[PDB]
Design an enzyme around this catalytic site. Structure first.
Site, mmCIF file in Angstrom:
data_model
loop_
_atom_site.group_PDB
_atom_site.id
_atom_site.type_symbol
_atom_site.label_atom_id
_atom_site.label_comp_id
_atom_site.label_asym_id
_atom_site.label_seq_id
_atom_site.Cartn_x
_atom_site.Cartn_y
_atom_site.Cartn_z
ATOM 1 N N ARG D 57 10.446 -38.647 -21.219
ATOM 2 C CA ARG D 57 10.112 -38.283 -22.588
ATOM 3 C C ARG D 57 8.852 -39.013 -23.029
ATOM 4 O O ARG D 57 8.778 -40.244 -22.942
ATOM 5 C CB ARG D 57 11.258 -38.612 -23.540
ATOM 6 C CG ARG D 57 10.850 -38.618 -25.003
ATOM 7 C CD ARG D 57 12.076 -38.704 -25.879
ATOM 8 N NE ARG D 57 11.773 -38.762 -27.304
ATOM 9 C CZ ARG D 57 11.888 -39.851 -28.053
ATOM 10 N NH1 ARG D 57 12.214 -41.005 -27.476
ATOM 11 N NH2 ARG D 57 11.691 -39.815 -29.361
ATOM 12 N N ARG D 99 7.612 -41.199 -45.924
ATOM 13 C CA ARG D 99 7.520 -42.650 -45.963
ATOM 14 C C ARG D 99 7.198 -43.122 -47.374
ATOM 15 O O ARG D 99 6.512 -42.437 -48.137
ATOM 16 C CB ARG D 99 6.451 -43.173 -44.989
ATOM 17 C CG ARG D 99 6.730 -42.856 -43.526
ATOM 18 C CD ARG D 99 5.967 -43.789 -42.601
ATOM 19 N NE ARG D 99 6.492 -43.759 -41.241
ATOM 20 C CZ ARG D 99 7.160 -44.754 -40.673
ATOM 21 N NH1 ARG D 99 7.395 -45.861 -41.373
ATOM 22 N NH2 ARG D 99 7.599 -44.670 -39.428
ATOM 23 N N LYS D 245 15.125 -30.407 -32.083
ATOM 24 C CA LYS D 245 15.895 -31.597 -32.419
ATOM 25 C C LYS D 245 16.599 -31.367 -33.751
ATOM 26 O O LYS D 245 15.942 -31.202 -34.785
ATOM 27 C CB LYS D 245 14.994 -32.829 -32.487
ATOM 28 C CG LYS D 245 14.501 -33.300 -31.126
ATOM 29 C CD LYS D 245 13.306 -34.236 -31.245
ATOM 30 C CE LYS D 245 13.651 -35.489 -32.040
ATOM 31 N NZ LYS D 245 12.567 -36.508 -31.952
ATOM 32 N N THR D 303 19.669 -40.354 -29.453
ATOM 33 C CA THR D 303 18.460 -40.678 -28.686
ATOM 34 C C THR D 303 18.532 -42.027 -27.976
ATOM 35 O O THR D 303 17.675 -42.343 -27.149
ATOM 36 C CB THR D 303 17.202 -40.705 -29.602
ATOM 37 O OG1 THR D 303 17.421 -41.597 -30.701
ATOM 38 C CG2 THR D 303 16.877 -39.322 -30.147
HETATM 39 K K LIG Z 1 9.539 -38.303 -32.034
#
Ligand SMILES: [K+]
Ligand SMILES: [K+]
Ligand SMILES: [K+]
Ligand SMILES: [K+]
Ligand SMILES: [Mg+2]
Ligand SMILES: [Mg+2]
Ligand SMILES: [Mg+2]
Ligand SMILES: [Mg+2]
Lengths: 494, 494, 494, 494
Positions: D57, D99, D245, D303
């Site tokens: 990945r 953020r 995802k 993950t």
């Molecule tokens: K990512």
């Protein structure tokens, strides 16, 4: 002790109300027809083929080798007029028999409670108190208390005394009987040769020379009886199938070992009824069918399932239901005797038998039937059985119209037939023996092919023949299986 | 369209070889016996009770109210000699009929291809070209192409023309027929009153006064026919069960709605065979049995399952298998007609029928049968059904010898019978109507009890009666179910 | 060797998206909470009860009888404030331990490849080449090649030599350790008394006098260990349940025999991880849960399933999934140790543990779970088990809100819990011992009732209490089971 | 709403006690490893390959195209040293992020109950009463009552007011946070481009040129997001697989439609935990795995399943159980992030992950798993699926060591993998794209073959390669499947 069975059917209103109009030879269940004067002509035999005949039975209890040779040759000529129908040839052995002697006035009225002597001196002219018996070992086989049946069970006799050359019995029911009537010894093993010198002659000098495919061996009582016939056939009769006829309690007791040595089974229910209680016969039929199904061995339900039709143009309701339930039980084949041999409606009997089979076959839930077989078969299976399993499975999943099986000895087609696909099994063989022996397996139709041909060429030729015979059409899928072991799906185009 | 069914059997060698020697009245399948001159005497009726008779059928197609009253009273006196056997009383209505007219020479030989006129003027003396028909609406019901059957299907006729007062047909097969023979109109609805004024009299002036428990209504064709009979019975006949006889294609087409209004079903297969193809009758039988089983509604397979025994002392093999397979199909009851009404071997027919049922009942895998029912019944079930389910389940798990059901209306025992326990259901009721109506359900045996008694006292009394009747013994467990709803296990001690 | 297991879940989008807002004490899975300074106050213990605490664990590896008596009395007063919550009291024995000796500088850095002597003289002040061991029989139990773990597996040592008073090992990995650290002997049976004189005192002079309900016996290695504790409890401790803690390979090897003698099982996975490979622990957990489920014996998954929460206000993702899967595996109870004994978030740990259990419990397909149990349990079951089976079954069929079980010893409620009903089991008992021992079984909630009361009166009282506690409402059905054996369905009205 | 799942395991004592010593690359479950400084060297990457790495990945949330190109080339050289291991290359897009802004003193301690303004002016230097947010559409997406998470859920905020350029919230819990921390909007759809101009550059100018096989698209919220990436890839990226995802409630709500457009799924459980309750995440994992299994679409559980190992040399017990249960759930692949990217024990993490997978894989009852799939898959299946079914079935029946699948696009191997055979699937392909994309499917191992070669020659070459790689031995059976469609069994000899 025996086994369990699970039938599954799906019955719609449409199947009850809408008439079936498919070809009678498309049925999966195969019909054994007994040959005789009623179907002596090539003209009648062709009508029987069109009606659903798949196996011709030559009853060797009657008629000489001449009588069966003029019938055999007439069948081969009916065969020539119907090339897309490869008939199996079955010889039914006379086998051991027991008969009463002659009578002074040709008739006796045995009265209940009276006493009757059965002597081994067959020359004795009998009367109501003493009658000869052809079975010399009778006094050594029956014991006091054993029951002796005479003239198709027209009269029972309880054994009171046994002596060297005779037995003394009590007549249990009043009835009048005649000369030379048959006898049965329920629950007692008959010590007579399974194959007489006359039976030996019919096998070695008719069955093997004329190319018979099956020997229905009357009155099989042990695995040793089967092995005797196997050794008698020898290399000359290696390709002839032995089909034991279960006819008495000994055959039931030793059925598992008899089946292991056999190529198949014939349930002679009429003769069985003279050895066991009438209410027990359906128990024996369903148990034997279930055991044969789980071994992959074919079974014939016999011998006269439309018995009334040999006088009547239509069967009784019970005879119709009996045929249908035998199919649902899982019989590979069903049999007619007097209906085709000497009756008035031979073609009418085969016609309705085919129609009943087609209706019962359309009932079957084939997926449930398949899983019932898989769940009950011993877990370690060979590569060949697994691939045959996958062919039946794949065919059901994609609704294939045909399973095409390439087979030299028939083994591959037998493995497939063991799992009862809903579609026809088209077996291709270069062996003329194989293409006429697979007739006894439900759902198998054979085609003779030339030797030394590639597999792909043979398969494409079978597809083209299947299209011509209306067995498959454009848009269908068909399964091909051969071999190492191979399963192939091909779609029909163009 | 219809439904699916799954039979499961376990057949041992011991059951085939070892004779059954249990009481014939211990069977689960119940026997309907048709009364007549052959069993007119109280002496014969008691023998029929001992042989396995559970329901007496009064055929009101023949005989007057006097003829059935001397028979009824003789049954009540046979009942007095056999107090542990509460017989159900069934009236079979004459119902609508269609018959040909009279003939000049009392015989005609209709030839194939010839043309035959059927006129509505019933006074016309017929000949081979024209014959009267009692059904006046015949020309309005048949169309060109419809088939007309005459004299138990002895001759078929294809309708060519329809006119106001006659139809013209083509004789399809050659046959000789007589006067006043019955007629059938396959695939056509017969527009005749389900209940005639004569049928009305037998119901209101015999069935209700004499206390008949069941009306077998001949030739039911719709739910409206059932509701008509329900309204005709009224409050006076509230407790009388209506059992439609399915006899033609209309009854098959509307079977689901007919069943919903019914208390049970009688499959008149012989009459059905005159309306549908012979090879379709077993389809209708198995579908109707399966639908009745899943509704918890009782079903009688009928009408003459040992037909040959009314002349012969032993049934044919096909008749024996037919009885056995009807039980395995799941029939609640089986029926005899001429075998007991006018035959030579009435007691012999009931005796062998009971023995066949006992053999088939011992085949059944009851756990598999139970799960087949549970898996196919609609998921939301009431509290009463769940408790009845648990009684059958618990009985099988602990091998209980009896399920004792306290029930006023019979509903509790019916719910239990729906799930086919391997053990007898002993229903206790204060209703004399209930204890004689539950006879039609497989496996239910009733005991009349006094009213206004506590549940615990009634149960202990049933256990003591069960011990005396050899239905249960010390060491056994039995299930008791009553009520709110209650399931109880008690062990028999002392 | 072991067993098979089948989980079945139904996960909807609604359950993922819609928040659960039921009472935390309505969960079926029960929570064992370890008592300590963090929950010393009655105020905190009441919060733990509201959060989902069902069993209080007294860890007797630390603290004196005084330390556990001030905790015990504080629990009884929290009990008084929460009368509808009957907490089980569990004593966790110190049991056999193995520890290293003291060190000259209190720290050694054992280096990989170096050699280390382990002596049985516990007075020896150790260094990096030689360290004492409290287990005197160590040289007689380990062989060359055996692995020795030190300080929670911080360092492994391969045994090179064994001698009378010492062993010589090779340090397999470099690590620094301290004084008096624990030791583990993977694949070796520790020959130390299961119950020390200190353990004997805690049992006979605390557990029995204070009325503890469970003895979690640390480091059970054989059925003989269980029988020793059973004999030590004697008649005075007849009602105290023995819960062996499986902690090493010996307990796994002899698990079946240990379980047969036990009242339940605790899987000490953290201690188990020091005896078997980390990747094998989930194998042991699922096998032990499955074996306990099929025996009807309760099992606690232990000891620190939310270990990070004893510092963090929220568990890790893996800890959350671990709790959920233990419930889906079929654990009866789950356990917290440091999270409630000395951690910062004791109430927060029990709260989230309850929420996870409720989510996992709502996953379970209870019908499939029920059939998985029925299919795998040995076929001959007693009357008592069959009736308990029928209660679970009937409850699922009618969607009953409660199974009410009358039980003196708890046996009836245990039989019901074995079959995992989707609804709460409300056990009614006059035994104060029984109402506090059933806490260890999944889905059982107890109510103390007075003795010498009729069954009908007790059931109606439980229904009224269930209505007040919101366990059942008008319109619901509930099952009552007691006794001979009786299953009853009652509807809640008024 | 969702779906049901059925796991089945067989756990023996031998598997618990006896160590596993098979090659780590023989496992069926594949491991996704995140590349970073900890595994930057070719030396470490080869160790990761030997440990069980199957897919690398590239996290494009950090690092430039240079940073990933020196890593990519180092992987290709590790690939050259391990030719029997064809690694898949996965690009993980940065995707949309939210953020907080900057702070005057770089730290604020938000207090519970206090009020906090979130402004869209990102230039504003924040304080404890007002903090900027990078998501300009924030006030248009949240409503009063919505919850806003900040800094990995370190603090929650309940929205009180929404205005054009700001929102006003109530701090729900006290916590101290820093600058530029991430934010999450549970139950609210984030209106940001799925693919930014930076994400577009990584796809078109890195993934396509460097030959990446998978795009793990962060924060997929709809099928339209997937179709956008499909169109962006265009013909140049036709062979690149899109792996959405699932990271928030929108992805869960629209999961079915997202899956239909996808080539596979990645469950980002850590990010999912910031959008749904912690106790709900295992519900989403098991539902998504079950839906992917029934579609035949691969799924990665992600993950950071061994998160503690990035500091510790051994994982926690909960992390080990989490990996094992994800395999038992039916995950195709499992993922490591920081453990291999920057941790201290990258090789140790992959090693234990492989060992856990092998233990869980040995648990699975593959026959029960197969039937669970067959029973739940929609009944009409294509010819290609039926033949792939038969290969898995036949392999299990004969205990074949390998299923050899010839496939250009990978479709045939995907169909086989859908049915989860207990033996390895060896896929042979001339496509370099196909042999590196099938890595994501459980149990598939690929071999690159030359084009324009006969099927028989390719199969024999694969058998010889399988023998050399110890994947099969003399005496084994192997299945070959190719094509029209063909299933073949061959035995390995010589
Ligand atoms: K990512
Ligand atoms: K013969
Ligand atoms: K009638
Ligand atoms: K302890
Ligand atoms: Mg014979
Ligand atoms: Mg009629
Ligand atoms: Mg310990
Ligand atoms: Mg994210």
């Amino acid at each position: 002790a025996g086994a369990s069975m699970q039938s599954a059917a799906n019955i719609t209103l449409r199947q009850i109300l809408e008439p079936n109009n498919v070809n009678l030879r498309s049925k999966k269940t195969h019909i054994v027809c007994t040959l005789g004067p009623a179907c002596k002509s090539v003209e009648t035999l062709v009508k029987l083929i069109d009606a659903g005949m798949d196996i011709c039975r030559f009853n060797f209890s009657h008629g000489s080798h001449e009588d069966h040779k003029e019938m055999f040759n007439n069948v081969l000529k009916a065969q020539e007029l119907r090339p897309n129908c490869l008939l199996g040839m079955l010889l039914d052995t006379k086998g051991p028999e027991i008969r009463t002697g002659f009578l002074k006035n040709k008739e006796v009225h045995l009265k209940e409670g009276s006493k009757l002597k059965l002597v081994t001196d067959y020359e004795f002219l009998g009367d109501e108190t003493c009658i000869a018996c052809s079975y010399k070992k009778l006094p050594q086989s029956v014991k006091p208390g054993n029951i002796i049946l005479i003239a198709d069970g027209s009269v029972s006799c309880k054994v009171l005394e046994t002596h060297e050359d005779h037995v003394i019995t009590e007549v249990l029911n009043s009835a009048v009987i005649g000369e030379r009537k048959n006898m049965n010894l329920p629950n007692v093993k008959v010590d007579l040769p399974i194959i007489s010198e006359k039976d030996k002659n019919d096998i070695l000098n008719f069955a093997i020379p004329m190319g018979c495919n099956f020997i229905a061996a009357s009155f099989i009582q042990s695995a040793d009886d089967v092995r005797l016939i196997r050794n008698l056939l020898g290399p000359r009769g290696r390709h002839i199938k032995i089909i034991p006829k279960i006819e008495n309690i000994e055959g039931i007791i030793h059925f598992d070992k008899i089946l292991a040595e056999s190529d198949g089974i014939m349930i002679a229910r009429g003769d069985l009824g003279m050895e066991i209680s009438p209410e027990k016969v359906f128990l024996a039929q369903k148990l034997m069918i279930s055991k044969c199904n789980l071994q992959g061995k074919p079974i014939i339900t016999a011998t006269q399932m439309l018995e009334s039709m040999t006088k009547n143009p239509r069967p009784t309701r019970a005879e119709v239901t009996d045929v249908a339930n035998a199919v649902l039980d899982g019989t590979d084949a069903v049999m007619l005797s007097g209906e085709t041999a000497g009756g008035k409606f031979p073609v009418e009997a085969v016609t309705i038998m085919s129609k009943i089979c087609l209706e019962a076959e359309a009932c079957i839930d084939y997926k449930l039937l398949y899983q019932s077989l898989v769940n009950a078969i011993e877990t370690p299976i060979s590569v060949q059985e697994a691939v045959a399993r996958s062919a039946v499975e794949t065919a059901e999943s994609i609704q294939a119209s045909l399973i095409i099986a390439l087979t030299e000895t028939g083994y591959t087609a037998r493995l497939i037939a063991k799992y009862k696909p809903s579609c026809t099994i088209l077996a291709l063989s270069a062996s003329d023996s194989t293409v006429k022996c697979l007739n006894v397996h439900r759902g198998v139709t054979c085609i003779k092919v030339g030797s030394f041909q590639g597999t792909d060429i043979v398969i494409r030729n079978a597809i083209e023949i299947a299209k011509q015979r209306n067995m498959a059409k454009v848009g269908d899928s068909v399964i091909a299986i051969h071999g190492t072991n191979l399963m192939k799906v091909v779609q029909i185009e163009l």
